[PDB]
Amino acid sequence: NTDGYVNWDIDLMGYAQLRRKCELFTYMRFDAEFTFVVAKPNGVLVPQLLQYMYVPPGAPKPTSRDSFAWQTATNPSVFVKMTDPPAQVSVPFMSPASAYQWFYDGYPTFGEHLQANDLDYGQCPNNMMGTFSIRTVGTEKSPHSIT
Amino acid sequence: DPIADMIDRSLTALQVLPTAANTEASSHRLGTGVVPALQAAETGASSNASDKNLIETRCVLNHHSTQETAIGNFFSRAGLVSIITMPNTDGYVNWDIDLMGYAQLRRKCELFTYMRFDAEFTFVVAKPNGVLVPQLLQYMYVPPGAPKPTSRDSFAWQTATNPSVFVKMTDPPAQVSVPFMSPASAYQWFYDGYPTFGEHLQANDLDYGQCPNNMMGTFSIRTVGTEKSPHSITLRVYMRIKHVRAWIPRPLRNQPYLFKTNPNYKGNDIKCTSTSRDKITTL
Amino acid sequence: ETGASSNASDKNLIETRCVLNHHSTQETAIGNFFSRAGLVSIITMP
Amino acid sequence: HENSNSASEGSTINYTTINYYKDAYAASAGRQDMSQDPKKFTDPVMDVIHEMAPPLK
Amino acid sequence: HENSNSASEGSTINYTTINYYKDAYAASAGRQDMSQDPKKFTDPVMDVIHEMAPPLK
Amino acid sequence: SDRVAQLTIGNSTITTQEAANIVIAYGEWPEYCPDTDATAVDKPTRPDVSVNRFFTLDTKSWAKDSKGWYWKFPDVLTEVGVFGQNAQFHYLYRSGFCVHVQCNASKFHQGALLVAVLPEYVLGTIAGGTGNENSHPPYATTQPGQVGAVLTHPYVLDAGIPLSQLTVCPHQWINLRTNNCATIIVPYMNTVPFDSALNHCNFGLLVIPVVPLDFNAGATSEIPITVTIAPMCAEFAGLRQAVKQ
Amino acid sequence: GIPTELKPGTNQFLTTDDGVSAPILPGFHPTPPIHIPGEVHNLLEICRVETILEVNNLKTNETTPMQRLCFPVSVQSKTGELCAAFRADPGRDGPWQSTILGQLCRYYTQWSGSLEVTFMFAGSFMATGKMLIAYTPPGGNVPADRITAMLGTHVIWDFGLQSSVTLVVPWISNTHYRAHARAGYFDYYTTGIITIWYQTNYVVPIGAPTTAYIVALAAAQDNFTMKLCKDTEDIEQTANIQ
Amino acid sequence: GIPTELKPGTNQFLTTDDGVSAPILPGFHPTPPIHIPGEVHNLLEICRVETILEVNNLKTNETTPMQRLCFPVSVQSKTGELCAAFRADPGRDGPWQSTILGQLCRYYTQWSGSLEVTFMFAGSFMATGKMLIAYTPPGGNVPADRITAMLGTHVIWDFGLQSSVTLVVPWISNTHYRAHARAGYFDYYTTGIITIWYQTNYVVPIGAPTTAYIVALAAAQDNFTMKLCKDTEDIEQTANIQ
Amino acid sequence: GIPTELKPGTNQFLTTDDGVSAPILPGFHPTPPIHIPGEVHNLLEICRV
Numbered sequence A: 001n002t003d004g005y006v007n008w009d010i011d012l013m014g015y016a017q018l019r020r021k022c023e024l025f026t027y028m029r030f031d032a033e034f035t036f037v038v039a040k041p042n043g044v045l046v047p048q049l050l051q052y053m054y055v056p057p058g059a060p061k062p063t064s065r066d067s068f069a070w071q072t073a074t075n076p077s078v079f080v081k082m083t084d085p086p087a088q089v090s091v092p093f094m095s096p097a098s099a100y101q102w103f104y105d106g107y108p109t110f111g112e113h114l115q116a117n118d119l120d121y122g123q124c125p126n127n128m129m130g131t132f133s134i135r136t137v138g139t140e141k142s143p144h145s146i147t
Numbered sequence B: 001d002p003i004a005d006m007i008d009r010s011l012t013a014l015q016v017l018p019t020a021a022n023t024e025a026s027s028h029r030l031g032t033g034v035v036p037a038l039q040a041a042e043t044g045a046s047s048n049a050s051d052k053n054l055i056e057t058r059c060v061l062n063h064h065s066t067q068e069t070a071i072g073n074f075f076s077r078a079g080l081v082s083i084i085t086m087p088n089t090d091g092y093v094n095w096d097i098d099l100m101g102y103a104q105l106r107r108k109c110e111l112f113t114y115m116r117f118d119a120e121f122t123f124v125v126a127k128p129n130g131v132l133v134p135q136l137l138q139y140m141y142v143p144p145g146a147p148k149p150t151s152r153d154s155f156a157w158q159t160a161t162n163p164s165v166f167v168k169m170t171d172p173p174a175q176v177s178v179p180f181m182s183p184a185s186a187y188q189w190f191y192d193g194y195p196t197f198g199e200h201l202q203a204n205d206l207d208y209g210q211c212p213n214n215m216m217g218t219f220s221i222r223t224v225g226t227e228k229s230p231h232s233i234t235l236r237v238y239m240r241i242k243h244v245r246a247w248i249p250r251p252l253r254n255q256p257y258l259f260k261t262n263p264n265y266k267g268n269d270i271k272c273t274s275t276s277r278d279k280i281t282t283l
Numbered sequence C: 001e002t003g004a005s006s007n008a009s010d011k012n013l014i015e016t017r018c019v020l021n022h023h024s025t026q027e028t029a030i031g032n033f034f035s036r037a038g039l040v041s042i043i044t045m046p
Numbered sequence D, E: 001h002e003n004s005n006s007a008s009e010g011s012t013i014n015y016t017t018i019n020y021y022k023d024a025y026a027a028s029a030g031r032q033d034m035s036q037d038p039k040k041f042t043d044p045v046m047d048v049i050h051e052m053a054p055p056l057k
Numbered sequence F: 001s002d003r004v005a006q007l008t009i010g011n012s013t014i015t016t017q018e019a020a021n022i023v024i025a026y027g028e029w030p031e032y033c034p035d036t037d038a039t040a041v042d043k044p045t046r047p048d049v050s051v052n053r054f055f056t057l058d059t060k061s062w063a064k065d066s067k068g069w070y071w072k073f074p075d076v077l078t079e080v081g082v083f084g085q086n087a088q089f090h091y092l093y094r095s096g097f098c099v100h101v102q103c104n105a106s107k108f109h110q111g112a113l114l115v116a117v118l119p120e121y122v123l124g125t126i127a128g129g130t131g132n133e134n135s136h137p138p139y140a141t142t143q144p145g146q147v148g149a150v151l152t153h154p155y156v157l158d159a160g161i162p163l164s165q166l167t168v169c170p171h172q173w174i175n176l177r178t179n180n181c182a183t184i185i186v187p188y189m190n191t192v193p194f195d196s197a198l199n200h201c202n203f204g205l206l207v208i209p210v211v212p213l214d215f216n217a218g219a220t221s222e223i224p225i226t227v228t229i230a231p232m233c234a235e236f237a238g239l240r241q242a243v244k245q
Numbered sequence G, H: 001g002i003p004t005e006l007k008p009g010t011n012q013f014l015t016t017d018d019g020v021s022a023p024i025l026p027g028f029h030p031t032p033p034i035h036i037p038g039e040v041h042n043l044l045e046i047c048r049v050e051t052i053l054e055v056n057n058l059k060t061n062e063t064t065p066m067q068r069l070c071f072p073v074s075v076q077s078k079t080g081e082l083c084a085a086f087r088a089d090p091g092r093d094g095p096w097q098s099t100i101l102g103q104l105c106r107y108y109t110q111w112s113g114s115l116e117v118t119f120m121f122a123g124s125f126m127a128t129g130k131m132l133i134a135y136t137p138p139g140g141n142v143p144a145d146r147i148t149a150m151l152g153t154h155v156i157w158d159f160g161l162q163s164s165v166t167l168v169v170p171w172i173s174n175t176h177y178r179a180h181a182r183a184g185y186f187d188y189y190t191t192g193i194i195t196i197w198y199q200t201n202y203v204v205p206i207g208a209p210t211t212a213y214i215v216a217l218a219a220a221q222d223n224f225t226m227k228l229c230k231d232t233e234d235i236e237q238t239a240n241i242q
Numbered sequence I: 001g002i003p004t005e006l007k008p009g010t011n012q013f014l015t016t017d018d019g020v021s022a023p024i025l026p027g028f029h030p031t032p033p034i035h036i037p038g039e040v041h042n043l044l045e046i047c048r049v
Ligand SMILES: CCCCCCCCCCCCC/C=C/[C@H](O)[C@H](N)CO
Pocket: A010, A011, A012, A013, A032, A034, A052, A053, A054, A076, A077, A078, A089, A091, A100, A101, A102, A127, A128, A129, I024
């Protein structure tokens, strides 16, 4: 985080106001539209170049601010500045199953279930969509805090 | 006709396949003579045994599209090809056009032998820490044979014929389109031979593999003013690939690259293609 | 001496085959030769 | 119209490309064709082999 | 229409020019003609010379 | 009834009694260059009998621990026959090929050969061992002539690509328990319709032993390999005095 | 002029966006194309071509990697031994990483369809034998003996004149597509275990050697498909090229 | 109003871009045109006009440059001497830089088609002789003697009433177009060597001088074309004009 | 090109605005849907239970 990059795992259940509405139904099938609003932690604006990169599950992830994963030869990516209007993208329905589900009664794997593997209960791999990574573009350390 | 001696076929034609092929139902079978399970791989043809000739199957109508596997959708993604920095110290750089400097795009393009495409270039430029400073810049493309600028204020910067862009740092990034411009009919990433005639010796041994149908001249940027700018600049160039046609596929490279001009590898650590395990019977 | 250029082609000196070429002459027109912006002045206010 | 100068003109792709300029290589990619020919890579053999018969008799 | 005032109006170029204003010299260049006449520069001679015959007999 | 085969062209004839089928590379027959793709204006010359015939190269020896061999085309034929003369007195050539490899053994031996034709086979070095030298192959390695050179690291084909997926190229197998020959017909594949024969080499032919040769002691321990090739539709243009290289 | 507004999404550089850009050379014409044989229109034409499978990927074969393409079969004294076993995941690391299918699946994420595995015997002419090749759907581990492994899909192979057999691996899964299997939670997308057993012994007469080899080839069927392109992880760039 | 977005490529100044700009004089009308003879519609009409070739570009002729347009032919004692030789590259520096074709090829990069070279004898009336003009495709150097040089394309010239002959240089190349040849890697685009030899001696009677001169003219054929406009390097601006 | 002006309301992010956005995956196809029982078309079907 302090090295100019973060890798955030895609999980849309982190804030309760949208979690309560989506848990009203069991199965859901939809296309999304994502918007990124970015500024300093006190709302201040500083001209600065940023890069977003979506990493599908199985793809290599960047481990540094200047790794080879930032070349984006295949990955979808956006380059946007802080002073600009906010970025917008469209995402299609991409699950291996026919619909997303917010409840999964069972274990994802076979074999013996014990107290070491008890945290597997309720984790369906049809909803894990990889990770998400942002960074400041330059190879040096930027002097500003980003949010 | 005084001389009776002087008077004196394609295999398969293409067709469209929008979806994957369905599966038809089948039953068991007991008979002699007919056998689809036995093949002969010695002839170099692959096997034609389907699912229904080995087991009994049901009927499955699938609608899986094959759109993402086309060569147009596989290549039309912008990838990084160059990092150009102006700390060079005189406010200008002359960079020779070579698109084999970064391994992620080099591996995809070396999958085919001959390629024919039009590009689309995009320049994203900022300071070496991402900082932004208002500043005027000029890009100029120099074809092979044209004179090159040797200073920040040379006469080559008048651009009377050369294509050029003037753009600022605070602006959205610039975009251009480049057509297919080789003297041959297609670019090739492999050229087995020497470009010139005459004797080949140990002084001229570096000529092996350099085809002049791919050398496209150089590329030059500068700060516009006649004085020394006080900021460090860093340019990143991204290239998309449009209207793709390819020929003659090849095996993919499994060794890490060493130089931009030759397929040389490291001779000590020959990387095995698969990750090794312990025993053959236990996965 | 008459100031006219010669009209001898390739086929009147050697034997030639048949070649259908589709090389366009678009880039040699005077419109495409001149429609490029060039520098004409540098004006400074010290 | 436009002076047609692209990379794919002899055997081309679908007719949904958008262009506002006068040169055809400025146009978009559009959606692609679904055409394919597998048998010149999986069966490059002179005498035809049927799947029922023995191939080496 | 537009009050036609260009540089090339008597013998003009192709009909693909785009314009949004009312004066015709604001319009684009467009694509050009393929017309050419070589013989008023390579053969400016009164009596016609054939390629087969001797030219000075 | 398809295990026997006979190929005749020119004044030569090849017969085989235990043969696999005939492989046409990418399903195209070799042919003369049409007028829609031609760029040269001079009328081409077609010898059409004296160059369309089977030429037999030298004979290698298959040991129990062999690596593999490669031949560069058409460098193998540029010093033999009248095809060696028309390729020295001209500037442009264009021709297909037809490769035939013979290797025979008895019913008590075992082994497997993988024959494959690979276009634009650009060789590389080991870059000085540690990988910091920009080494280059010499002229004797890249164009060996009608003798052919051996391979050093056959697992990477001395070009950085693995052997494990070489079969995407046109290929055949010589398995010693079924057949004894392999045959490929290659058309002309290049970005330009004509090319020089002394500065460009179109494809390479690779013979690599995947399964090692094994026998019991007492059998014939001398297993030879012989390659025989033939141009198909050779044309030439651009006459000039003789230049060998 | 006409009143407009700029929406969100302005002035962004989207790498997979398709649009119209300005040209730099007006009136340019390319070189006219000629007919070059072997045109690829779709990437699924390559995935049906068989390449060699690296079954024998042991830790001792790293300095002599020419032996990893052939795995041996010898004369046994007992009955019903197994000779090899591996997972049938084309995307997971292991024996399938050496294929042109295994390298092309790495550029995508989800795949569907059936496979095929072709084995080819490369022994002498006088030698004979019978092998059993079985494919077991997931839920169990590798079977301990032959009488457990014969319950799945299996084919009995006979050596003779025809020296090649094709075990087709049919598409049996709960979802329409499968992601790339891995240890953790993504082993839910596993696809099975392929083993191979001695049906009879490997019988050889006097004067012919007692050890033969088997090569294995792999390809895809006609209903194979892929989606959701991503980058591979087999290549890297740590040091700068040149 | 209507929702829009600005794409990449905004606010750039592309010098070869063609668009619509705002006018400054509304309702203006130009002067009506009159018929002026000699209108040029295409730049290929100039390239078919012959100009003088500078064959004799020696280092001693830099202070008396009127002699560089004529090269001498005299009475020989031996047979089969060569009188001149030069490369046939219209874009490379050398004898072709003095032509209107050689100056117009510098504004482009790639060219195609055939050329022609016209020689004109300018001796006395009583003098005679025969010359051999040969063009050799690349691969060899300049031939050492006449019996090597006669293998390429060649034409035998006879002096008489008609005092001009045209050696046409036909288009023999592997690529459709040719870039500008140069020492290095771009000599792959070279095109040949043109020499000229004494077929017989130059025979003159008594009272007429023993030394004559030959001028050489060069032009292009009808299938000539060019592409990819760039700037020339023959002109410069180091000091400021005025 | 065509003369325009930007009106008030430019460069704002309205959360209940409906517009067209750019896609990230060209040529993508979803999983084909199957028939799942109990489809809700309107929220007033729940309020009568
Ligand atoms: C450049 C675009 C980057 C944005 C990429 C977004 C793609 C990921 C979309 C995921 C769609 C929802 C999938 C599952 C949602 C919840 O996190 C899970 N159900 C957790 O239970």
